[PDB]
Design a protein around this ligand. Structure first.
Ligand SMILES: [Ca+2]
Ligand SMILES: [Ca+2]
Ligand SMILES: [Ca+2]
Ligand SMILES: [Ca+2]
Ligand SMILES: [Ca+2]
Ligand SMILES: [Ca+2]
Ligand SMILES: [Cl-]
Ligand SMILES: [Cl-]
Ligand SMILES: [Cl-]
Ligand SMILES: [Cl-]
Ligand SMILES: [Cl-]
Ligand SMILES: [Cl-]
Ligand SMILES: [Cl-]
Ligand SMILES: [Cl-]
Lengths: 224, 224
């Protein structure tokens, strides 16, 4: 249940969206999907303050939920979303709101409008790096998908692993139908080394925890 | 725990193997693996009496466990295993025991010694059909793997779905890293139509139940 899943934490509710604060100016948005009736599954992303605007990491499950995140930033925070980045292939809602959207260039080969320039070490450069700061964008290699990316806030000790990172007590890596199974373990090692000091690890389908999420994900990936 | 998993049923223990009777002359063998310490996971197969011998469906997790199944048939039942069929790509133990082993011809492209001849409707013919009777061998198409097969005992109302069929309360299809995701739903429909009357559905990683296992697996496969 949603109530059981949120009993741990201090959650602010806005429509169907659950907001929780990871750090000053760093919001996690959580929404739920129960499509076949099997139980609500969370999807998490971030809303990060920069000056008088916010930067969005990932959409919610639905257009209507994504519209609520945009409205919370504009109406409540009074810091409208000006840019968004998705970590894997809701988008229509962002474009309806004239939000500049960013993705890995090969993801979804509705696309994001802007393709991130990644250097050969996996770090974003150019307009993506300027526009999404203070987020640091990192491409670790193929894992859950070929083109999955990650983001970090090194000054606040937060790293977001998207769909690549699973919970510290996970027993499997979920759906590997699109996965690069041979590369997965090294990509997790690359992520861990890109954000080596962060003690708050956030991810797409489990609540935030510590670096045990990286350790367990790596162990599972090494068995593929 | 193994005890919690077997609390429902009447289990006979032989070494590491749990045996349960699905029908007169039809044994299910269950063994457990807890490789990374996350909890014991069952693997199920069948041991089917034919006259003064038995036919084995699938190995256990390990060579040592598979040796125990062979010993139970020879020592306890006094009906030694004379043939075996595997439903997806322990084998060394069967060959050490001089057991004739059968598999889909394209599986594992240690191989089974004998390749099943399947007709264009998916039914085994030839030596496989003679040697593994009363089991009826059926290739439904790609699903959990490209070459997964299934077996049935239509006169006893039992069908065994291997790794393709999941539990009636499952919320996912497990590991799809090798799956034919586009074909999965039709292959499940093919299996259901091949064994249309069986009310006991057995499978590789969950205990036997009714046709809800087919219904749920099909629903999950239709979402791929
Ligand atoms: Ca709306
Ligand atoms: Ca600029
Ligand atoms: Ca390991
Ligand atoms: Ca032994
Ligand atoms: Ca013969
Ligand atoms: Ca359906
Ligand atoms: Cl992607
Ligand atoms: Cl470069
Ligand atoms: Cl896994
Ligand atoms: Cl860091
Ligand atoms: Cl196979
Ligand atoms: Cl034919
Ligand atoms: Cl699934
Ligand atoms: Cl039948």
């Amino acid at each position: 249940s949603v109530a059981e899943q949120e009993a741990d934490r201090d959650i602010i509710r806005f429509g169907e969206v659950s907001f929780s604060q990871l750090a000053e100016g760093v919001w996690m948005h959580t929404t739920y999907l129960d499509l076949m009736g099997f139980g609500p599954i969370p999807s998490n992303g971030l809303l990060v303050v920069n000056g008088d605007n916010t930067i969005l990491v990932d959409t919610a499950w639905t257009d209507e939920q994504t519209e609520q995140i945009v409205a919370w930033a504009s109406m409540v925070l009074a810091k409208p979303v000006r840019a968004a980045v998705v970590t894997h292939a809701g988008m229509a809602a962002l474009h309806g709101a004239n939000i500049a959207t960013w993705a890995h260039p090969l993801s979804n080969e509705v696309p994001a409008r802007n393709a991130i320039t990644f250097d050969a070490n996996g770090w974003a450069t150019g307009e993506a790096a300027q526009s999404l700061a203070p987020l640091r964008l990192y491409y670790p290699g193929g894992a859950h998908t070929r083109d999955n990316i990650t983001v970090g806030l090194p000054e606040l000790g937060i790293a977001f692993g998207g769909c690549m990172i699973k919970a510290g007590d996970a027993s499997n890596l979920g759906n590997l139908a699109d996965a690069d199974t041979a590369a997965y373990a090294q990509s997790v090692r690359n992520f861990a080394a890109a954000f080596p000091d962060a003690r708050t690890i956030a991810m797409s389908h489990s609540p935030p925890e510590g670096r045990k999420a990286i350790e367990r994900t790596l162990d599972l990936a090494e068995e593929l």
